[PDB]
C-alpha cells in the first residue's frame, strides 16, 4: 500500500492532485504526508535544519487536532490548501520572488489555517455566545483560534519544527503566518480583493518578467491572496474533486442548520436542508466570489493561471446547466 501512496504523491506539484485518494492511502494522514512531501520537495528540512522526526511529530499532532466529524473543514481540506498554495508559489511569474522564510510561512500557514475547526461559522459562534466568540470578541473568531492552536502545538514535546530558526526569523515568520491566516476570514475578502485589484492595476514586472514586490506590505498581500485563493480553489479543480468538496461543505452547512433549528434560531443562508439550492449557490458563489478573485489572480500572474481559470468557468457552466 506504501508504493501506491508514493505513486500518487508523484502528482504533488500538479493542480488537481487526487487528495481524497491520498487521504485513503495514508490511513487518514493526507496533511502529514503531503506536508512532508512538500518540505522534502522544496528542501525545507536542510534549509531550516528541521529534524525529520520533529517534522513528523508536529504534523501528526496538528492533523490530530483537525476534527474527524467535520465533513469539510478537516485535515483533507488543510492538506488540499497546503498543496494548492505549494502549486501557486511555483507559478512562473513569482519565480525567485519570495524568500525561503516567506515560502515556509505560506506553507505553514496553509497547514494550520483551519485547525480545530468546529464545523460552524464565525457568525454562529457569535450568535450563540460561544466560549470562542467571547474569548475573541467576535473578531475573526475561528481564524484567531486556528492560529493559537497551530502555534501552541509547536511547544509540545519534540514538536518545535522552528527550533533552529534565529529569534529574528521566528518573529518574522510568526507575523507573516498570523497575517496570512487572518486573511482567510471571508469577511475580509472584499477589502483583500480590492487591494489585489489595485496591485494588478499598478503592477510592476522586473526585467526577467516576474513580479516586483519592494516592501513587506506588497509581499504579504500577495501571500494573503495566494492562500485565500488556495482556500477558495475547490471550484477551480477537476469536477470529480469539486463535487466531493461541494457534498462536504453542504453536509457541514446543513449540520449547522440543524443545530440552529434545535435552538430555535433563524437558519443561516444555505444551511436549511429543506430549502437549499446547492447548484444555484455554487453558481452564485463562483459568479460573485470565486471567479472575481481568481480572475484578478490570473491577471496578476498572467498567463500562468489561465488553465485554472478555464476549469473554474467550465465548472460554473456545468453546475449552471444542471439547474
Ligand atoms: C461566507 O462567504 C460566502 C460563501 O462561503 C464560502 C463557503 C466555502 C469556503 C471554503 C473555504 C473554507 O471555508 O475553508 C458562500 C457564498 O455563497 C453565495 C451564494 C449565492 C449568493 C451569494 O451572495 C453568496 C455569498 O455571498 C457567499 C459568501 C459571502 C458571504 C458574505 C458576504 C457574508 C447570491 C445568490 C445565490 C443565492 C444564487 O448564491
Ligand atoms: Mg478557515
Ligand atoms: Zn479553509
Q: Is 188 exposed, middle or buried (0-12, 13-18, 19+ CB in 10 A)?
A: middle
Give, using CA atoms, the residue closest to atom 35 of ligand 1. 284
* Grid-cell match 429543506, residue found: 274
* Grid-cell match 491520498, residue found: 22
Q: Is 214 exposed, middle or buried (0-12, 13-18, 19+ CB in 10 A)?
A: exposed
Give, using CA atoms, the residue closest to atom 20 of ligand 1. 284
How far is the centre of ligand 2, averaged over its atoms, from the C-alpha of 46 (Å)? 30
Tell me if 244 is assigned to a ligand binding site.
no
* Grid-cell match 475561528, residue found: 142
Question: Which range of residues forms the domain containing residue 162?
Answer: 1-323
Which grid coordinates are listed for 98? 519570495
* The 3-state secondary structure of 162-178, one letter per residue: CCCCCHHHHHHHHHHHH
Q: How many CA atoms lie within 13 A of 209 on its CB side?
A: 6
Distance CA 160, CA 156 (A): 7
Distance CA 278, CA 40 (A): 39
Task: Find the CATH number of the domain harbouring 222.
Answer: 1.10.1300.10
Q: Domain tally for the chain? A: 1
How far is the centre of ligand 3, averaged over its atoms, from the C-alpha of 151 (Å)? 17
Distance CA 309, CA 315 (A): 10
Distance CA 271, CA 104 (A): 36
| Whether the Cβ atoms of residue 138 and residue 180 lie closer than 8 Å to each other | no
> How many other β-carbons are positioned within 10 Å of the β-carbon of residue 197?
16
Which grid coordinates are listed for 233? 480553489
User: Residues lining ligand 1, judged by CB closer than 6 Å?
Assistant: 73, 77, 114, 186, 231-232, 249, 280-281, 284-285, 288-289
Which grid coordinates are listed for 31? 496533511
Cis omega (within 30 of 0) for bond into 303: yes
Annotated catalytic sites, by residue?
73
Amino acid at each position: 500500500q506504501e508504493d501506491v501512496l508514493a505513486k500518487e504523491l508523484e502528482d504533488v506539484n500538479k493542480w488537481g492532485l487526487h487528495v481524497f485518494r491520498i487521504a485513503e492511502l495514508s490511513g487518514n494522514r493526507p496533511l502529514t504526508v503531503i506536508m512532508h512531501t512538500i518540505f522534502q520537495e522544496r528542501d525545507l528540512l536542510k534549509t531550516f535544519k528541521i529534524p525529520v522526526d520533529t517534522l513528523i511529530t508536529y504534523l501528526m499532532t496538528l492533523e490530530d487536532h483537525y476534527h474527524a466529524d467535520v465533513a469539510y473543514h478537516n485535515n483533507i481540506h488543510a492538506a488540499d490548501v497546503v498543496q494548492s498554495t505549494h502549486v501557486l508559489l511555483s507559478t512562473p511569474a513569482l519565480e525567485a520572488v519570495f524568500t525561503d522564510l516567506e515560502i515556509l510561512a505560506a506553507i505553514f500557514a496553509s497547514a494550520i489555517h483551519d485547525v480545530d475547526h468546529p464545523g460552524v461559522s464565525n457568525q454562529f459562534l457569535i450568535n450563540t455566545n460561544s466560549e470562542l466568540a467571547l474569548m475573541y470578541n467576535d473578531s475573526s473568531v475561528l481564524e484567531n483560534h486556528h492560529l493559537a492552536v497551530g502555534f501552541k502545538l509547536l511547544q509540545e514535546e519534540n514538536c518545535d519544527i522552528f527550533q533552529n530558526l534565529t529569534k529574528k526569523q521566528r518573529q518574522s515568520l510568526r507575523k507573516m503566518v498570523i497575517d496570512i491566516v487572518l486573511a482567510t476570514d471571508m469577511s475580509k475578502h472584499m477589502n483583500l480583493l480590492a487591494d489585489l485589484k489595485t496591485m494588478v492595476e499598478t503592477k510592476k514586472v522586473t526585467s526577467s518578467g516576474v513580479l516586483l514586490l519592494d516592501n513587506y506590505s506588497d509581499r504579504i498581500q500577495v501571500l494573503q491572496n495566494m492562500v485565500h485563493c488556495a482556500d477558495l480553489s475547490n471550484p477551480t479543480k477537476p469536477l470529480q474533486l469539486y463535487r466531493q468538496w461541494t457534498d462536504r461543505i453542504m453536509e457541514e452547512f446543513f449540520r449547522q442548520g440543524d443545530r440552529e433549528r434545535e435552538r430555535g434560531m433563524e437558519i443561516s443562508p444555505m444551511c436549511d436542508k429543506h430549502n437549499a439550492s446547492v447548484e444555484k449557490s455554487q453558481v452564485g458563489f463562483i459568479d460573485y466570489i470565486v471567479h472575481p478573485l481568481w480572475e484578478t489572480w490570473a491577471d496578476l500572474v498572467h498567463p500562468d493561471a489561465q488553465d485554472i481559470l478555464d476549469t473554474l468557468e467550465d465548472n460554473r457552466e456545468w453546475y449552471q446547466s444542471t439547474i
